[PDB]
């Protein structure tokens, strides 16, 4: 992989995911969206082994959409993240494990709180104010540790995110072709089309 960042601010969760898809020698695409909407107020970004990332994400999406229809009810971010964790925990002792790392950004409509969950391919779940997978955290966490506040606005979160991306673009050897940024709040999910 590449770069999936998440930051939970006052009233929303922001997910930033790189656009590059590289198959060895060449960059085949520079506009790839590494995310799936699981429910109206729950977004999951992903990074890992080719093929398995999308297969896993769409499989989770289908299951949450099935639940939503059956019960006429949106599962809480916590419930969705637990379901996802179990699937990955099940997957590691499989014949061929999914090598997929995810961030789940959701807005809990019951508690009126944004929530960010970080889950790696082993099924290691942690709820965080900000998170990442791969080497992304190595470059960005020192900036987030310094500037982050729990009462940040969405705009301040995006500015702190820009600083993180700038540091990545400076010190990372790979060209990840920028990031697609999406915001999850009480009104649902929307994409920031200029970043």
């Amino acid at each position: 992989m590449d770069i999936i960042l998440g930051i939970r601010v006052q009233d929303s969760v922001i997910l930033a995911s790189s656009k590059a898809v590289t198959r060895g020698i060449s960059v085949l695409k520079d506009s790839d969206d590494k995310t799936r909407q699981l429910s109206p107020h729950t977004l999951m970004s992903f990074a890992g082994e080719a093929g398995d990332t999308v297969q896993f994400a769409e499989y989770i999406q289908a299951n949450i959409q099935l639940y939503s229809i059956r019960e006429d009810y949106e599962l809480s971010p916590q419930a969705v993240s637990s379901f996802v964790r179990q699937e990955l925990a099940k997957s590691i002792r499989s014949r061929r494990p999914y090598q997929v790392n995810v961030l789940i950004g959701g807005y809990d409509k019951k508690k009126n709180k944004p929530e960010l969950y970080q889950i790696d391919y082993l099924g290691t779940k942690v709820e965080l104010p900000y998170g990442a997978h791969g080497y992304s955290g190595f470059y960005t966490f020192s900036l987030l540790d310094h500037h982050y506040r729990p009462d940040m606005t969405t705009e301040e979160g995006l500015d702190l995110l820009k600083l993180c991306v700038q540091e990545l673009e400076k010190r990372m050897p790979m060209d990840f072709k920028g990031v697609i940024v999406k915001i999850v709040d009480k009104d649902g999910i929307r994409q920031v089309d200029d970043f």
Binding site: A89, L122, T124, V126, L128, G131, G137
Partner: protein, 204 residues
């Protein structure tokens, strides 16, 4: 590569006079990278406490598994499980994965509600029970904990004295381990009151 030392962390349990104590650090990491400072490794099912070190996905999985099993136990038995019984359940549950084991180091701590007797126990990743009178240790700083506990421990400590002993055993062991620390919690357990204390420690 070694599954028991990817995430890091430690658990220690001690017995005292009419009390037990169990304590853990709060770190979760991806090898060198610190990921979470709020990853508690002690869980409880009624009055029986279980600390688990090792691979974090298995720690979470086993907690969910023993919550599952102790909840069914209670519905059927119409009573909360005891530490001695739970210890055998942990041993049984681990050994059933003998050739595909959970990479964990569990520690049981609690007081028998009927006899009032303090009880602790430890296990290897496949269920071998270590039922020590004095203390049980587990994790990536187990050697350090063995050293601290062996010298600091004395039998029949009062609850408030046991707290200091176990806290110092944990803290100084964790400060000699790269993969342990980032906070700590100590449970002091008496027959009908349990106190939980978060310790102040260095965050490196």
């Amino acid at each position: 590569s070694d599954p028991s030392s990817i995430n890091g962390g430690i658990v220690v349990a001690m017995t005292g006079k009419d009390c037990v104590a169990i304590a853990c650090d709060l770190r979760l990491g991806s090898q060198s990278l610190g990921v979470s400072n709020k990853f508690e490794k002690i869980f409880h099912y009624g009055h029986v406490f279980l600390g688990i070190t090792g691979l974090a996905t298995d720690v979470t999985t086993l907690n969910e598994m023993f919550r599952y099993k102790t909840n069914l136990y209670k519905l059927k038995e119409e009573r909360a499980i005891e530490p001695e019984t739970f210890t055998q359940l942990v041993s049984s549950s681990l050994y059933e994965r003998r050739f595909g084991p959970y990479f964990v180091g569990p520690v049981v701590a609690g007081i028998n509600s009927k006899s009032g007797k303090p009880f602790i126990a430890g296990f290897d990743l496949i269920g071998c029970i270590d039922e020590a009178k004095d203390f049980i240790v587990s994790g990536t700083a187990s050697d350090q904990l063995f050293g601290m506990c062996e010298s600091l421990y004395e039998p029949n400590l009062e609850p408030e004295d046991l707290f200091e002993t176990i806290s110092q055993a944990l803290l100084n062991a964790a400060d000699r381990d790269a993969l342990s620390g980032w906070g700590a919690v100590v449970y002091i357990i008496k027959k009908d009151e349990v106190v939980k204390r978060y310790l102040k420690m260095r965050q490196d």
